[PDB]
């Protein structure tokens, strides 16, 4: 009882020491993952000015990808885009399309079968264990090309600053199935370019869409990896704070029970001495 709060004090005193270490761990990961996000942000730009950005297209088959975290102490990150991937999968399908749902991260499958149980087909996890490379993102891209959709949707958190992580929808159209069809604006917008490939334009657009898919996915799991470390740095500055205010209210209550125990022990000793003396 008076030890039940004494053992509860040392429990919360170490939680506020553990989650202060996890915050400085996640702040050291966030500073070196940030030097890789800006270097991956460059190669995304030439594809979105060559292919535009068309999120609301009339695809008959789609692959949506929600890029979440592996570990789940992030604080409103892996369910935030789950709110967004259910808001996109209620936006695209009003016409009876096919949708295959893929999640990256262990916290993605564990929250997408909650909402989307039948269209979930593939789960990638343990991505962020050592580091994220382009060759790793390429094999994740290739299995999205095992399915042959008209479009792709990537859902990730873009690392604007250490505070704001705006969830991004990034989309990639399939080359001679749907990418060429959206470019037919009073003729075509792609005919200005003179193709210097070995084969003709539908084969250079096939190589270019897969290269667009591999960099949009590599940037997705780099933007989301340090939007996870910055969310873990902020979820453990709220937890070390809250376990310091809880420990502050536990040492005050222990010190009341400490003072009340000495008064109780004393009064029982005086009442027994006065009964004899």
């Amino acid at each position: 009882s008076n030890q039940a709060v004494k053992q509860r004090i040392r429990a919360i005193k170490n939680i506020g020491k553990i989650t202060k270490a996890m915050k400085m761990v996640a702040a050291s990961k966030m500073k070196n993952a940030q030097i890789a996000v800006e270097q991956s942000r460059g190669l995304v730009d030439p594809f979105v000015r060559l292919f535009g950005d068309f999120p609301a297209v009339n695809s008959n088959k789609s692959v949506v990808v929600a890029v979440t975290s592996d570990k789940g102490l992030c604080g409103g990150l892996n369910s935030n885009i789950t709110k967004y991937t259910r808001a996109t999968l209620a936006t695209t399908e009003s016409e009876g399309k096919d949708v295959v749902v893929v999640s990256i991260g262990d916290k993605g499958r564990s929250q997408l079968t909650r909402i989307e149980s039948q269209r979930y087909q593939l789960a990638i996890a343990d991505t962020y264990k050592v580091r994220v490379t382009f060759g790793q993102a390429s094999l994740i891209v290739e299995e999205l090309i095992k399915h042959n959709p008209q479009s792709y949707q990537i859902l990730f958190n873009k690392f604007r600053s250490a505070i704001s992580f705006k969830p991004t929808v990034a989309t990639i159209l399939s080359p001679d199935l749907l990418e060429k069809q959206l470019e037919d604006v009073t003729g075509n917008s792609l005919d200005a370019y003179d193709i210097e490939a070995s084969h003709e334009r539908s084969d250079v657009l096939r190589d270019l869409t897969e290269f667009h898919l591999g960099v949009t996915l590599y940037n997705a799991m780099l933007e989301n990896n340090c939007s996870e470390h910055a969310s873990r740095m902020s979820a453990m500055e709220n937890s070390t704070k809250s376990a310091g205010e809880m420990l502050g209210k536990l040492t005050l209550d222990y010190n009341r029970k400490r003072q009340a125990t000495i008064t109780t022990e004393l009064i029982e000793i005086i009442a027994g001495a006065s009964a004899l003396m």
């Binding site: 005050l252 010190n255 009341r256 400490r258 003072q259």
Partner: protein, 52 residues
């Protein structure tokens, strides 16, 4: 409170001069609500904390 109050109330400013007291304060069991510091703190007009 009247043993401390009997001591601390002789430390004051009269019309002839003043006694200004600097008292080292020990806090038992690191509890500021303990009756020995909390009665002492009623008389203190300043605290000077010296930290390592």
């Amino acid at each position: 409170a009247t043993d401390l109050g009997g001591l601390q109330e002789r430390i004051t400013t009269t019309t002839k001069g003043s006694i200004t007291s600097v008292q080292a304060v020990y806090v038992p069991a690191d509890d500021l609500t303990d009756p020995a510091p909390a009665t002492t703190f009623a008389h203190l007009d300043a605290t000077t904390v010296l930290s390592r």
